[PDB]
Design an enzyme around this catalytic site. Structure first.
Site, PDB file in Angstrom:
ATOM      1  N   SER A   1       6.556  -6.397  10.786  1.00 14.39           N
ATOM      2  CA  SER A   1       5.799  -6.716  11.983  1.00 14.39           C
ATOM      3  C   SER A   1       5.319  -8.160  11.909  1.00 14.39           C
ATOM      4  O   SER A   1       5.185  -8.738  10.830  1.00 14.39           O
ATOM      5  CB  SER A   1       4.609  -5.777  12.138  1.00 14.39           C
ATOM      6  OG  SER A   1       3.696  -5.926  11.055  1.00 14.39           O
TER       7      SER A   1
ATOM      8  N   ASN B   1       9.960   3.789  17.426  1.00 14.98           N
ATOM      9  CA  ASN B   1      10.893   3.468  16.353  1.00 14.98           C
ATOM     10  C   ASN B   1      12.263   4.087  16.586  1.00 14.98           C
ATOM     11  O   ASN B   1      13.290   3.443  16.322  1.00 14.98           O
ATOM     12  CB  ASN B   1      10.321   3.933  15.022  1.00 14.98           C
ATOM     13  CG  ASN B   1       9.143   3.118  14.605  1.00 14.98           C
ATOM     14  OD1 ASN B   1       8.932   2.026  15.130  1.00 14.98           O
ATOM     15  ND2 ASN B   1       8.353   3.638  13.661  1.00 14.98           N
TER      16      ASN B   1
ATOM     17  N   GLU C   1       0.856  -1.164   0.000  1.00  7.56           N
ATOM     18  CA  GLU C   1       0.000   0.000   0.000  1.00  7.56           C
ATOM     19  C   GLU C   1       0.897   1.219   0.000  1.00  7.56           C
ATOM     20  O   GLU C   1       1.926   1.214   0.690  1.00  7.56           O
ATOM     21  CB  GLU C   1      -0.919  -0.018   1.217  1.00  7.56           C
ATOM     22  CG  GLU C   1      -1.862   1.100   1.280  1.00  7.56           C
ATOM     23  CD  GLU C   1      -1.817   1.787   2.604  1.00  7.56           C
ATOM     24  OE1 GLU C   1      -1.070   1.330   3.494  1.00  7.56           O
ATOM     25  OE2 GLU C   1      -2.543   2.790   2.751  1.00  7.56           O
TER      26      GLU C   1
ATOM     27  N   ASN D   1       6.468  -4.758  21.219  1.00  6.23           N
ATOM     28  CA  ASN D   1       6.017  -3.380  21.343  1.00  6.23           C
ATOM     29  C   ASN D   1       5.637  -3.040  22.778  1.00  6.23           C
ATOM     30  O   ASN D   1       5.720  -1.874  23.176  1.00  6.23           O
ATOM     31  CB  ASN D   1       4.843  -3.120  20.406  1.00  6.23           C
ATOM     32  CG  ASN D   1       5.280  -2.570  19.058  1.00  6.23           C
ATOM     33  OD1 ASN D   1       6.452  -2.279  18.861  1.00  6.23           O
ATOM     34  ND2 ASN D   1       4.341  -2.441  18.121  1.00  6.23           N
TER      35      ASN D   1
ATOM     36  N   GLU E   1      28.170 -14.661  11.339  1.00  6.82           N
ATOM     37  CA  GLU E   1      28.670 -14.654  12.702  1.00  6.82           C
ATOM     38  C   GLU E   1      27.533 -14.594  13.711  1.00  6.82           C
ATOM     39  O   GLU E   1      27.661 -15.155  14.812  1.00  6.82           O
ATOM     40  CB  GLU E   1      29.642 -13.494  12.910  1.00  6.82           C
ATOM     41  CG  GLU E   1      30.659 -13.780  14.009  1.00  6.82           C
ATOM     42  CD  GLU E   1      31.853 -12.842  13.981  1.00  6.82           C
ATOM     43  OE1 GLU E   1      32.131 -12.257  12.898  1.00  6.82           O
ATOM     44  OE2 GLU E   1      32.496 -12.686  15.056  1.00  6.82           O
TER      45      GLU E   1
HETATM   46  N1  LIG Z   1       7.195  -0.601  16.677  1.00  8.93           N
HETATM   47  C1  LIG Z   1       6.415  -0.295  15.645  1.00  8.93           C
HETATM   48  N2  LIG Z   1       5.320  -1.095  15.397  1.00  8.93           N
HETATM   49  C2  LIG Z   1       4.495  -0.833  14.364  1.00  8.93           C
HETATM   50  C3  LIG Z   1       4.750   0.246  13.528  1.00  8.93           C
HETATM   51  N3  LIG Z   1       3.771   0.263  12.605  1.00  8.93           N
HETATM   52  C4  LIG Z   1       2.912  -0.761  12.838  1.00  8.93           C
HETATM   53  N4  LIG Z   1       3.342  -1.450  13.938  1.00  8.93           N
HETATM   54  C5  LIG Z   1       2.741  -2.655  14.541  1.00  8.93           C
HETATM   55  O1  LIG Z   1       2.526  -3.613  13.536  1.00  8.93           O
HETATM   56  C6  LIG Z   1       1.288  -4.254  13.674  1.00  8.93           C
HETATM   57  C7  LIG Z   1       0.472  -3.810  12.464  1.00  8.93           C
HETATM   58  O2  LIG Z   1       1.197  -4.186  11.326  1.00  8.93           O
HETATM   59  P1  LIG Z   1       1.655  -3.199  10.156  1.00  8.93           P
HETATM   60  O3  LIG Z   1       3.154  -3.106   9.980  1.00  8.93           O
HETATM   61  O4  LIG Z   1       1.037  -1.841  10.347  1.00  8.93           O
HETATM   62  O5  LIG Z   1       0.960  -4.026   8.962  1.00  8.93           O
HETATM   63  P2  LIG Z   1       1.403  -4.004   7.431  1.00  8.93           P
HETATM   64  O6  LIG Z   1       2.699  -4.745   7.235  1.00  8.93           O
HETATM   65  O7  LIG Z   1       1.381  -2.585   6.891  1.00  8.93           O
HETATM   66  O8  LIG Z   1       0.271  -4.902   6.716  1.00  8.93           O
HETATM   67  P3  LIG Z   1      -1.171  -4.357   6.226  1.00  8.93           P
HETATM   68  O9  LIG Z   1      -1.368  -2.876   6.562  1.00  8.93           O
HETATM   69  O10 LIG Z   1      -2.148  -5.343   6.828  1.00  8.93           O
HETATM   70  O11 LIG Z   1      -1.246  -4.474   4.729  1.00  8.93           O
HETATM   71  C8  LIG Z   1       0.725  -3.764  14.979  1.00  8.93           C
HETATM   72  O12 LIG Z   1       1.180  -4.660  15.968  1.00  8.93           O
HETATM   73  C9  LIG Z   1       1.385  -2.423  15.174  1.00  8.93           C
HETATM   74  O13 LIG Z   1       1.508  -2.164  16.551  1.00  8.93           O
HETATM   75  C10 LIG Z   1       5.860   1.062  13.752  1.00  8.93           C
HETATM   76  O14 LIG Z   1       6.094   2.035  13.025  1.00  8.93           O
HETATM   77  N5  LIG Z   1       6.690   0.781  14.821  1.00  8.93           N
HETATM   78 MG   LIG Z   2      -0.092  -1.352   5.765  1.00 11.21          MG
END
Ligand SMILES: Nc1nc2c(ncn2[C@@H]2O[C@H](COP(=O)(O)OP(=O)(O)OP(=O)(O)O)[C@@H](O)[C@H]2O)c(=O)[nH]1
Ligand SMILES: [Mg+2]
Ligand SMILES: Nc1ncnc2c1ncn2[C@@H]1O[C@H](COP(=O)(O)OP(=O)(O)CP(=O)(O)O)[C@@H](O)[C@H]1O
Ligand SMILES: Nc1nc2c(ncn2[C@@H]2O[C@H](COP(=O)(O)OP(=O)(O)O)[C@@H](O)[C@H]2O)c(=O)[nH]1
Ligand SMILES: COc1ccc(-c2[nH]nc3c2-c2cc(OC)c(OC)c(OC)c2CC3)cc1
Ligand SMILES: [Ca+2]
Ligand SMILES: [Ca+2]
Ligand SMILES: [Mg+2]
Lengths: 424, 317, 60, 438
Positions: free
Chosen positions: D140, D228, D71, D206, D254
């Site tokens: 994630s 982040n 996306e 998280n 390693e």
């Molecule tokens: N630490 C951290 N976690 C994130 C971040 N963005 C999303 N998450 C976590 O990731 C999970 C959601 O997944 P995303 O990475 O947003 O999903 P995606 O890979 O974009 O997949 P879709 O949107 O379903 O197409 C949740 O547990 C969020 O808390 C980020 O910028 N930092």
């Molecule tokens: Mg997404």
């Protein structure tokens, strides 16, 4: 860029559709001529979801107005924001559907549906990436109920991998046009179970009571009821219209709200209920919105269990306080959430409130007590159908008794499916 | 307003505190598997400690200390007193560990009396191992109290809160085998409710055999010119401080995401120099009937409401 | 407590202290699985268009 | 010099990518336009920072990175953010509609439309590698893209580069942030599918970062930017040895050999200290022993668990800042006494230690104060299985009623892949229990 095509169908559909568009066009800075005169630009970040861009880039709703009589629709377009609607997007027959599901679904509506799907196609072809449709309609009339679910049968056919999402007003004896309403509505629900992903059940009983008991309106008008609906509907959709940490689209919403595909009828709630100078404090927002008195569907949440919940707070307020209060309502009342869906309550916040309210909170509940509504409509239906009463209005349009018992059956099942997960 | 699950039903002691909690109008029992609880009254073993401290907005506390089994099973126990520096140790019986880890010639160099106790009784270092499990030395001469020549056994109840304060309950019990005691014949050699509630007359020289502390002190004064405090309790408090403070850096929930308290039963023995000995540390102990009301309430004051406030009977060690 | 293999440089150092010593799926097979997912998807879409087509028959 | 290619997948992977690469730039003094004034080998170089950067004739230092989201919305911010010039259009990749938090939709349905294009975009970077050693994949557990698409890419990367190592940084889901109620589904599904394909995976809960971001930073709710920017610090210390002169963990192979005795157990626990608030203006700077001590407090771990109730299988210490070896063995001497630190019978009790003298860089106007010395500890402890048990339970609760399963079947998956993936995790939980108790 995730647009929705909005369709309002019938008398109730287009009256509620009408206020919703003035309510949120106010929220997005668009004037009755379609011209943007807002302060922020968060008003315009997700604007494309509900509005197409225009002339000197004015904004026309992505709305299709559908009826089988012109009366309500002339009324819309001569009303306030009636000018913003694309005149080509006014699709209407002349005969009406006589509060008769069969006329909407099989005879009168069948004649008109193709013209509507021509407008849905031109509205949706102009979509870099369309995500789904939202339909507004009552289920006790003929046009919004019978033709509306026909339209969904068809949209599903032409667009099988888009989300179909409706705002559906349930008949109630307290606020009733005709006696056949439980018929029209039992037949619509059989359709909604199959062909929608999410339906918000707006009960006309509950809107009356909120208006009478709460808002203190001695004899409420339909405008008073649609005040509560255009506020809930603004509420329910603020995530789709405004940016946030939440990247909210219809499919992600349905994925997390609907554990079992048939069980997708949601109980909306709103707070504060207004018809006011002290903003509510966050602890009240969350106490009110979870109170049965603020639900739009006229079922007691304490009579069932929440499969899933989605809440949103509007205004600038303590993001930690809504966290705290939200987490606190769960433990005061953990008996009423299902143990087997961890973390089934999700909460968003938007810094932009609705007109007039500095702080508002809208609630979306997939509760197994929604069963009360279908139990209610089912009792009424059977009450008449055992004596086959008023059926001639329908057998006169080709329908057979069999189609009726099937619809009685599918809805009594949906009631069983809801009871079994109240016990788990 | 506080929540708590119960996940050990036939827990004699904690069944009662679950009663007391509800009976304050400020605590609600949820179902076992409801996760949004303030207080776990966990199951005896396989207690899922790894799933505590993870519910946002929830202060969670459980009535058990992860790792405390190392003190409470004689296998791990014995092991602890030899492996740990803080335990040299002149109050534990000499001990080893046999499997049907593993080192067995250990058991030989000491064999020139030589009597030991068979369970996990004989003087023969052979018939025992037919069990094929800890197996060690029997105090061939204990203290023996009268009128009636009753060989006894002392249980103390210790509470350890989330802060690791060590709380000795002031009421100990003395479970006597009030009948005679001979030599070689395996009845009074074992003194509690396992060979005397089945095999072994269930309260001859007093009420159910069971001397509480006030009487045993009066006997000691009259019978011996000493007190229970000086002859025994000092040694008891020393044993309790020493075990629980050995394992503290391994089970302390001071800086972790949930928190623990736990009630222990210590079981001691005496000889005639009024030397106190330690047998077993019980991790799930039942109380003495007359004491349930007072101990079970003291658990709530010190271990439960110390962490969940609302609207002494212990000696801090 | 013994130190091993110390390496220095301009950036810093690295080493090892010791306190006591001891006592694949091929593509064509995922091609199958992945296309076998596309077919049950389109079976499901077919059986849907089949029921929609039955509904047109009833409508008619 | 052997190059490392990084792959940021999904919203989490991409956004953490931004935090890491911006930190990389600050650390190697690379500017928002790819210029590196300190770099004298213009448009070429065998330096260790070239492991992560290739160069152009105009002196542009360009990540060896591929961003991919199903996306556009997030990667777009990269395309128009402060570091737009850093990247090449071809290495930021977007689809049309995302996986809607649905593993099966990102793996099966929307997976194949993008997988052959993305491996091709990877081959572009792989081909300007004179000795590629493998990839570092950021994603994630919870997202549909993060979980579903990554497990598909990790399948193909194995087939197209079977001789290359694959290291993961995976974001474990936590309700205090988090999104879908079905993230336990995506989590089990994607590790079951990625297990035999990953050589080493750093889980970041998280929940841990949130708490850290709240206690040690006095930040009431933390943002993704907060989370982040802290995850970037931990990643930076883990990766620093590939980008800087050193002798410990200088290649991805390693990490396997130093931290992973059995391939199935390739999830090292990470502990990092210190985390100090930039608005805690007067602050007492902590000693070597104080920060090495904190490496054993659960409240500094990237995953909350209790290493006291399991065994170790490797310990790695990485120090950035004013650290000398003597202070480290003095702190290790103390901590060995004070703390229960039980290794497995068949492994040496011991620490592989590395020191870089450049202390941690903090983003100007960020939330972390700059500290004189910092440590990051990579421990392979069996107590990380606590995070599987948590995840697997949430999965059992839902799947016993088949909640939400229909969204996955609707995409082609079969309930069997659910119970196949859950039995794999049952075996992964047994593995951890063998190694860990008697
Ligand atoms: N630490 C951290 N976690 C994130 C971040 N963005 C999303 N998450 C976590 O990731 C999970 C959601 O997944 P995303 O990475 O947003 O999903 P995606 O890979 O974009 O997949 P879709 O949107 O379903 O197409 C949740 O547990 C969020 O808390 C980020 O910028 N930092
Ligand atoms: Mg997404
Ligand atoms: N070293 C010793 N010398 C003499 N008698 C001893 C002794 N150790 C134990 N005993 C006797 O053994 C009986 C106590 O048994 P014990 O407390 O070990 O129960 P148990 O083996 O069943 C463990 P659990 O309570 O977990 O089931 C005692 O009256 C007691 O006199
Ligand atoms: N809340 C609300 N309900 C309405 C409104 N108009 C009609 N209804 C209800 O809708 C049902 C009748 O359907 P209606 O929309 O009038 O007929 P249609 O034009 O054939 O779709 C009855 O239950 C009425 O109570 C309205 O503006 N608001
Ligand atoms: C029960 O657990 C969950 C519930 C919803 C979601 C989700 N994901 N993506 C979105 C949403 C979402 C939530 C909305 O309410 C919070 C929401 O507002 C009505 C809302 O606006 C319509 C949306 C749409 C954007 C996730 C988990
Ligand atoms: Ca006609
Ligand atoms: Ca160079
Ligand atoms: Mg009407």
């Amino acid at each position: 860029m995730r647009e929705i095509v909005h369709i309002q169908a019938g008398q109730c559909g287009n009256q509620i559709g009408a206020k919703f568009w003035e309510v949120i066009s106010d929220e997005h800075g668009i004037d009755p001529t379609g011209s943007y005169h807002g302060d922020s630009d968060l008003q315009l970040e997700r604007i494309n979801v509900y509005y197409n861009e225009a002339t000197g880039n004015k904004y026309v709703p992505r709305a299709i107005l559908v009826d089988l009589e012109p009366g309500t629709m002339d009324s819309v377009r001569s009303g306030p924001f009636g000018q913003i609607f694309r005149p080509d997007n006014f699709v209407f027959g002349q005969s009406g559907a006589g509060n008769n599901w069969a006329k909407g679904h099989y005879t009168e509506g069948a004649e008109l549906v193709d013209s509507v799907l021509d407008v849905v196609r031109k509205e949706s072809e102009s979509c870099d990436c369309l995500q789904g449709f939202q339909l507004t309609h009552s289920l006790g009339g003929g046009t919004g109920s019978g033709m509306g679910t026909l339209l969904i049968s068809k949209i599903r056919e032409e667009y099988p991998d888009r989300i179909m999402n409706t705002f559906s007003v349930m008949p109630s004896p307290k606020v009733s046009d005709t006696v056949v309403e439980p018929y029209n509505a039992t037949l619509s629900v059989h359709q909604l179970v199959e062909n929608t992903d999410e339906t918000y059940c707006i009960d006309n009983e509950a809107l009356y009571d909120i208006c009478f008991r709460t808002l203190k309106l001695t004899t409420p008008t339909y405008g008073d009821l649609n005040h509560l609906v255009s506020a809930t509907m603004s509420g329910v959709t603020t995530c789709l219209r405004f940016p946030g940490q939440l990247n909210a689209d219809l499919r992600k919403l349905a994925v997390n709200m609907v554990p079992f595909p048939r069980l997708h009828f949601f109980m909306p709630g709103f707070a504060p209920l207004t018809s006011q100078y002290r903003a509510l404090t966050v602890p009240e927002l969350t106490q009110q919105m979870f109170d049965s008195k603020n639900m739009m569907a006229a079922c007691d949440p304490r009579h069932g269990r929440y499969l899933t919940v989605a809440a949103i707070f509007r205004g600038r307020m303590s993001m930690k306080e809504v966290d705290e209060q939200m987490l606190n309502v769960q433990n005061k009342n953990s008996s009423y959430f299902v143990e087997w869906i961890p973390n089934n309550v999700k909460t968003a916040v938007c810094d932009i409130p609705p007109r007039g309210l500095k702080m508002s909170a809208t609630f979306i509940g997939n509760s197994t007590a929604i069963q009360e509504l279908f139990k209610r409509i089912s009792e009424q239906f059977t009450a008449m159908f055992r004596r086959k009463a008023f059926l001639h209005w329908y057998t006169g349009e080709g329908m057979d008794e069999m189609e009726f018992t099937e619809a009685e059956s599918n809805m009594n099942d949906l009631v069983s499916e809801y009871q079994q997960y109240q016990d788990a | 307003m506080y929540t708590f699950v119960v996940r050990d039903e036939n827990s004699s002691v904690y069944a009662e505190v679950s009663r007391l909690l509800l009976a304050t109008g400020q605590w609600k029992r949820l179902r076992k598997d409801n996760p949004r609880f303030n207080l776990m009254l966990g199951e005896r073993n396989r207690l899922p400690f790894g799933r505590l401290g993870h519910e946002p907005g929830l202060v969670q506390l459980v009535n058990y200390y992860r790792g405390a089994d190392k003190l409470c099973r004689k296998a791990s126990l014995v092991k602890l007193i030899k492996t740990s520096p803080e335990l040299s140790c002149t109050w534990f019986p000499e001990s080893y560990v046999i499997y049907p880890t593993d080192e067995r010639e250990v058991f030989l160099a000491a064999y020139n009396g030589n009597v030991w106790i068979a369970k996990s009784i004989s003087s023969e270092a052979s018939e025992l191992l037919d069990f094929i499990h800890v197996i060690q030395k029997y105090l061939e001469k204990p203290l023996l109290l009268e009128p009636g020549h009753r060989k006894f056994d002392i249980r103390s109840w210790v509470l350890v809160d989330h802060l690791y304060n060590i709380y000795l309950y002031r009421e100990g019990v003395l479970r006597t085998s009030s009948e005679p005691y001979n030599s070689a014949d395996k009845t009074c050699h074992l003194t509690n409710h396992c060979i005397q509630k089945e095999y072994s007359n269930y309260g001859r020289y007093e009420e159910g055999n069971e001397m509480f502390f006030e009487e045993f002190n009066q006997y000691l004064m009259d019978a011996l010119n000493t007190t229970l405090e000086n002859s025994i309790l000092l040694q008891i408090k020393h044993i309790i401080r020493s075990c629980l403070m050995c394992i503290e850096p391994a089970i302390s929930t001071k800086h972790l995401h949930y928190q623990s308290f736990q009630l222990f039963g210590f079981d001691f023995m005496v000889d005639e120099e009024l030397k106190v000995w330690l047998i077993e540390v019980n991790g799930a102990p039942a109380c003495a009937q007359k004491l349930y009301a007072e101990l079970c309430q003291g658990i709530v004051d010190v271990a439960i409401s110390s962490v969940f406030p609302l609207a002494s009977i212990f000696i801090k060690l | 407590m013994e130190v091993i293999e110390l390496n220095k440089c301009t950036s810093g150092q690295s080493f090892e202290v010791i306190l006591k010593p001891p006592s694949d799926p091929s593509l064509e097979e995922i091609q199958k699985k992945l296309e076998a997912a596309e077919e049950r998807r389109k079976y499901q879409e077919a059986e849907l268009l089949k029921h929609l087509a039955e509904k047109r028959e009833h409508e008619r | 010099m052997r190059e490392c290619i990084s792959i940021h997948v999904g919203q989490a992977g991409v956004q953490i990518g931004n935090a890491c690469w911006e930190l990389y730039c600050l650390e190697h003094g690379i500017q928002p336009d790819g210029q590196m004034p300190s770099d004298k080998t213009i448009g070429g170089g065998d330096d260790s920072f070239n492991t992560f950067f290739s160069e152009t004739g105009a002196g542009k230092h360009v990540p060896r990175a591929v961003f991919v989201d199903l996306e556009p919305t997030v990667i777009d911010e990269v395309r128009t953010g402060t570091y737009r010039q850093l990247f090449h259009p071809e290495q930021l990749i977007t689809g049309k509609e995302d996986a809607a938090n649905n593993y099966a939709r990102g793996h099966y349905t929307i997976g194949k439309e993008i997988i052959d294009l993305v491996l091709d975009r990877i081959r572009k970077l792989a081909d300007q590698c004179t000795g590629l050693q493998g990839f570092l994949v950021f994603h994630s557990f919870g997202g549909g893209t993060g979980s579903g698409f990554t497990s598909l890419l990790m399948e193909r990367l194995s087939v197209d580069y079977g001789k290359k190592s694959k290291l993961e940084f995976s974001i474990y889901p936590a309700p205090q942030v988090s999104t879908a109620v079905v993230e336990p589904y995506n989590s089990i599904l994607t590790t079951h599918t990625t297990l035999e394909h990953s050589d080493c995976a750093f889980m970041v809960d998280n929940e841990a970062i949130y708490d850290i971001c709240r206690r040690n930073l006095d930040i009431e709710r933390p943002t993704y930017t907060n989370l982040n920017r802290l995850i970037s610090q931990i990643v930076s210390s883990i990766t620093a040895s590939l980008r800087f002169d050193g002798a410990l963990n200088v290649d991805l192979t390693e990490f396997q050999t130093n931290l992973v005795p059995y391939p199935r157990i390739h999830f090292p626990l990470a502990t990092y200290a210190p985390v100090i608030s930039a608005e805690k203006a007067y602050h007492e700077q902590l000693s070597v022993a104080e920060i090495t001590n904190a490496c054993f407090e659960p409240a500094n771990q990237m995953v909350k668990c209790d290493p006291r109730h399991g065994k170790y299988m490797a310990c790695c210490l990485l120090y950035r800042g004013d650290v000398v070896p003597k202070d480290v063995n003095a702190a290790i001497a103390t901590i060995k006494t004070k703390r229960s630190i039980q290794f497995v019978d068949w492994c040496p009790t011991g620490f592989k230690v590395g020191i870089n003298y450049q202390p941690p860089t903090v983003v100007p106007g960020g939330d972390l104060a700059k500290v004189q010395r910092a440590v990051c500890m990579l421990s392979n402890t069996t107590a990380i299985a606590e995070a599987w048990a948590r995840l697997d339970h949430k999965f059992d609760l839902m799947y016993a009623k088949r909640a939400f399963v229909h969204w996955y079947v609707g995409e082609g998956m079969e309930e069997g892949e659910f119970s196949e993936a859950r039995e794999d995790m049952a075996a992964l939980e047994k593995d951890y229990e063998e190694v860990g108790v008697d």
